[PDB]
Enzyme design. Structure first.
Site, short mmCIF file in Angstrom:
data_model
loop_
_atom_site.label_atom_id
_atom_site.label_comp_id
_atom_site.label_asym_id
_atom_site.label_seq_id
_atom_site.Cartn_x
_atom_site.Cartn_y
_atom_site.Cartn_z
N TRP A 96 -8.45 -1.68 -1.00
CA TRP A 96 -9.02 -0.52 -1.66
C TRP A 96 -10.12 -0.85 -2.67
CZ3 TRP A 96 -8.42 4.61 -0.05
CH2 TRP A 96 -7.32 4.86 0.84
N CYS B 162 -8.00 10.24 6.46
CA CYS B 162 -7.92 10.04 7.91
C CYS B 162 -6.55 10.57 8.29
CB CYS B 162 -8.07 8.55 8.29
SG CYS B 162 -9.84 7.82 8.11
N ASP C 220 -9.63 4.11 14.11
CA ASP C 220 -10.30 2.95 14.61
C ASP C 220 -9.21 2.18 15.34
OD1 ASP C 220 -10.98 -0.01 14.61
OD2 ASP C 220 -12.52 0.54 13.21
N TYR D 57 -4.06 9.05 -1.19
CA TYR D 57 -2.83 9.59 -0.66
C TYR D 57 -1.82 9.77 -1.76
CZ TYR D 57 -5.09 8.90 3.76
OH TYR D 57 -5.97 9.04 4.82
N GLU E 57 0.88 -1.20 0.00
CA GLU E 57 0.00 0.00 0.00
C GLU E 57 0.93 1.26 0.00
OE1 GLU E 57 -3.86 1.80 2.40
OE2 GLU E 57 -1.96 1.54 3.55
N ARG F 128 -6.86 12.52 12.08
CA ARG F 128 -8.16 13.02 12.59
C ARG F 128 -9.10 11.97 13.19
NH1 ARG F 128 -12.46 11.93 9.63
NH2 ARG F 128 -12.25 11.20 7.50
O1 LIG Z 1 -6.16 3.46 8.20
C1 LIG Z 1 -7.30 3.70 8.63
C2 LIG Z 1 -8.37 3.88 7.73
C3 LIG Z 1 -9.64 4.12 8.24
N1 LIG Z 1 -9.86 4.23 9.61
C4 LIG Z 1 -11.29 4.47 9.98
C5 LIG Z 1 -11.56 5.52 11.04
C6 LIG Z 1 -13.08 5.51 10.93
O2 LIG Z 1 -13.64 4.38 11.60
C7 LIG Z 1 -13.34 5.47 9.41
C8 LIG Z 1 -13.53 6.88 8.78
O3 LIG Z 1 -14.83 7.52 9.01
P1 LIG Z 1 -14.95 9.11 9.32
O4 LIG Z 1 -13.97 9.17 10.44
O5 LIG Z 1 -14.60 9.88 8.12
O6 LIG Z 1 -16.31 9.62 9.60
O7 LIG Z 1 -12.18 4.80 8.90
C9 LIG Z 1 -8.79 4.04 10.53
O8 LIG Z 1 -8.85 4.09 11.77
N2 LIG Z 1 -7.52 3.79 10.02
#
Ligand SMILES: O=c1ccn([C@H]2C[C@H](O)[C@@H](COP(=O)(O)O)O2)c(=O)[nH]1
Ligand SMILES: O=c1ccn([C@H]2C[C@H](O)[C@@H](COP(=O)(O)O)O2)c(=O)[nH]1
Lengths: 316, 316
Positions: free
Chosen positions: B82, B198, B221, B146, B60, B218
């Site tokens: 993806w 993110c 998960d 990205y 990636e 920002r």
């Molecule tokens: O590398 C990654 C990619 C995605 N997310 C998650 C965070 C959220 O659960 C979701 C994005 O939703 P929003 O935060 O935009 O609303 O994807 C991660 O934690 N890490």
């Protein structure tokens, strides 16, 4: 006390920061990556261990808030934080006819007989900006500053985004949004601005009826800068919470490079001897809600009782 | 051990995070603002308390690094992180002629008899992207991801900035620069992308011959996302340090909203019972220096000895 995080960042840089050169003949001690919290329901974090001029910190923020980029609003509240960038422009320009004024910032601090002409021209430059409309519009207007980056980001199809106005709207209708982000870093202006923004980006957050705000600050002058930065953004937290009718939460301050200038060690050590006092209370006008049309008289500070100010030389 | 910061973020969200709704029928527990450090001279932070597939995390990153935005490179290393965003496009389009596939993500997880047709179409969509050139170019190409945000940010006068290539150059010639910043947040695309990034922004830092990197994320998960995020960016730290011939320093990970999904509590608690093992070592090719032209075989992981993987349901 409320301010301890800041006294803890200064100490941390003292016995822990490493020596690092920069844009100045002197260096800095610096660390990389640092985070502090201020619970804003505990009081407003204007430092008590050093007198900080709120009126300046607030007339600057109103300016940002109105999306203004013209020095003139500032001069009209006797705020000069921004005059050197305006006047620089003046000086490197056809229309200017005076003693060259090359590298005036460094040379303001050696010669007590130059520092006196710089102070004359500048007073006239400020005078012309205040009274000559055509003039302001030509050199009073800084172009890219927080106020237009927040409220009028230029797109590629030549329109204008109000990041902050839209964000506030989002806060009103999708409070749990994870994308409440106003950014001030445009990668296409960055390599040609004399100051790419220090306050890079921030993000709002809502939970249980409280608004919190995290600031990503790429570069912070711990002694001179960071006391003002803290209050700017804690004020903004308050104003946005007020407009959305939410309670106020925490201001999180994140740093990239936090530094202390090597000629400010003594002043900072002096500061660490003082013992914080109780924080002032902030107090916003209840009758007025649109924060975009807030004035000076709408934001009161109560019970601010600081130690005397600590004058210090500047870094050049 | 190296990974403790992550086990400390999970615990912290467990007995401290507040309940917060989001884009899903379930909620999340979440905190706002959080910072962790990994000394990268101590070893590479791929989690040991849960098997994490490095090959995915690295194919990636190479993709990002080549400035590629086409799924096809990924399929060719059996990496599917993806595919759902590509295939979504396919489905809402004229040329598609199949069982509607409306809201397939939710409905993948109820019906074991839909989840079987979704898995058929997707295999064909992946097949066409891999073999039909015209096809890839039309639906294999994600547009804003990205890789182009880093290496081809679109300006207003219709050209292209390579933020990252320029940054790396800056690192080479102004190591003490306080403006080493690659940002992935464009305020003009943000309101119309199905996923505004993110990984919002990062900033490089140099001192005593060491490169460090701070990431502003920002939204994270904690269970599914953040283990991969950590290794991505620790790898990037390494690669950039390698290209500039600097020693590797610290990876600082800053969060806005860090969350844990309410159906992942048990899995995370299970994780907290395990006892970290010694970290793997990273090992990059010494003969090759241009990181832009790095391949799969140029980046080895040594002594990775994880616990078994923890399967968990996903949030929809
Ligand atoms: O590398 C990654 C990619 C995605 N997310 C998650 C965070 C959220 O659960 C979701 C994005 O939703 P929003 O935060 O935009 O609303 O994807 C991660 O934690 N890490
Ligand atoms: O509110 C402010 C404004 C400016 N600075 C300082 C940080 C640096 O000393 C200088 C910017 O120089 P660079 O970081 O761009 O190189 O301004 C602050 O700390 N706070």
């Amino acid at each position: 006390m409320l301010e301890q995080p800041y006294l803890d960042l200064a100490k941390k840089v003292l016995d822990e920061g490493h020596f690092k050169p920069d844009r100045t003949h002197t260096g800095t001690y610096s660390i990389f990556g640092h985070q502090m919290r201020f619970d804003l329901s505990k009081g407003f974090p204007l430092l008590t261990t050093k007198k900080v001029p709120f009126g300046l910190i607030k007339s600057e923020l109103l300016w940002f808030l109105h999306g203004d980029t013209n020095i003139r609003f500032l001069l009209q509240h006797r705020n000069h934080i921004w005059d050197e960038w305006a006047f620089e422009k003046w000086v490197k320009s056809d229309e200017y006819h005076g003693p060259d004024m090359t590298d005036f910032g460094h040379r303001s601090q050696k010669d007590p007989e130059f520092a006196a002409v710089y102070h004359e021209e500048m007073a006239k430059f400020d005078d012309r900006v205040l009274h000559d409309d055509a003039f302001a519009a030509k050199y009073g207007d800084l172009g890219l500053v927080y106020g237009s980056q927040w409220r009028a980001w230029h797109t590629s199809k030549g329109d204008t985004i109000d990041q902050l106005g839209d964000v506030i709207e989002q806060i009103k209708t999708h409070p749990y949004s994870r994308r409440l982000i106003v950014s001030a870093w445009n990668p296409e202006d960055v390599p040609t601005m004399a100051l790419p923004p220090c306050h890079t980006l921030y993000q709002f957050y809502v939970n249980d009826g409280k608004l919190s705000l995290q600031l990503y600050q790429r570069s912070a002058d711990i002694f001179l800068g960071v006391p003002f930065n803290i209050a700017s953004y804690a004020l903004l937290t308050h104003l946005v919470a007020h407009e959305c009718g939410l309670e106020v939460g925490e201001f999180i301050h994140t740093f990239g490079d936090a530094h202390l200038a090597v000629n400010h060690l003594d002043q900072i050590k002096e500061q660490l001897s003082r013992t914080p006092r109780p924080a002032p209370t902030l107090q916003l006008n209840p009758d007025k809600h649109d924060i975009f049309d807030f004035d000076m008289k709408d934001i009161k500070l109560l019970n601010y009782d600081p130690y005397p100010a600590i004058k210090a030389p500047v870094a050049v």
